[PDB]
Design a protein around this ligand. Sequence first.
Ligand SMILES: O=C1CC[C@@H](c2ccccc2)N1Nc1ncnc2[nH]c(Cl)cc12
Length: 167
Amino acid sequence: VNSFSGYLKLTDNVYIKNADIVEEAKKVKPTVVVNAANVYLKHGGGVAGALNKATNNAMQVESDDYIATNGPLKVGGSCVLSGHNLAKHCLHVVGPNVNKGEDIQLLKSAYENFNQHEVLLAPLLSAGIFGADPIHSLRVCVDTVRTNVYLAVFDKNLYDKLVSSFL
Ligand SMILES: O=C1CC[C@@H](c2ccccc2)N1Nc1ncnc2[nH]c(Cl)cc12
């Protein structure tokens, strides 16, 4: 077993909790924490800003070196970097930002990256400041990810709505 606790099971492989992913990561120290990244790995706000702050900006320093070497990610893409003090690894995943004119169909591709990892602690991709409907996103997650995913949803009101209206 592992050190996750307090999660509501949604399917064979998807679990969910009303929690801050940053606090969940510090407590569990999972193998993989997912960051809700942008293509530039500029971790300004939301999950990305909060994770980076918890690493004392080390995530940003590492990310800037990654971009200087490799260039930007693709929308729907990902890269594996250090988890710093929060996890062994951080999987930086770019969901489409609907406010940036990006294809919502790329959300499925974004979640497909989770399948390369047996277990992950993750946020809902493209939710929050990325502008997509979190209910939709949960549906895409459940219908796309086959590995074991532990979702942290920080917003209590949304968690209650997602968990109660989940099909
Ligand atoms: O709860 C949700 C639902 C989707 C996403 C979101 C994206 C864009 C705008 C609002 C919300 N989100 N944020 C977080 N999820 C987990 N841990 C977190 N920690 C901190 Cl800080 C924030 C945070």
